[PDB]
Amino acid sequence: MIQQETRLKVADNSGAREVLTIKVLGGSGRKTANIGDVIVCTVKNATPGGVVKKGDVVKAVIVRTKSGVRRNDGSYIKFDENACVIIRDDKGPRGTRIFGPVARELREGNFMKIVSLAPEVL
């Protein structure tokens, strides 16, 4: 349940560490995003070196939220922190590695490259 102004840790190696969300893409008035949605965000904390630099305006996909999803069989999955992954506007990542587990519903938005690179999809 990610809205404007929240901070998400970045779960890849593109050089960002922290990101602040600016908009939730979608419709007019869409307030909150969750696992699988694409946000546009600023980098507030970068890693020295690295492709993406501080002050950049990127878009990301949300993997991992703290208030996670309900699935169709009435089971749920929650995580312990909100994380994201910076993407390349063709749903490819900008980094090359993904750290941490990642929800299964990323396959429904065709983020196959993210789902492959991750240590186990949950």
């Binding site: 089971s75 999955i77 922190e81 941490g100």
Partner: peptide, 17 residues
């Protein structure tokens, strides 16, 4: 705890899955 990230998981007890 999966990769340093705690993950929890909730099921109906009688589910067929």
């Amino acid at each position: 705890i999966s990769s340093g990230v705690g993950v929890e998981r909730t099921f109906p007890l009688h589910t067929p899955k």
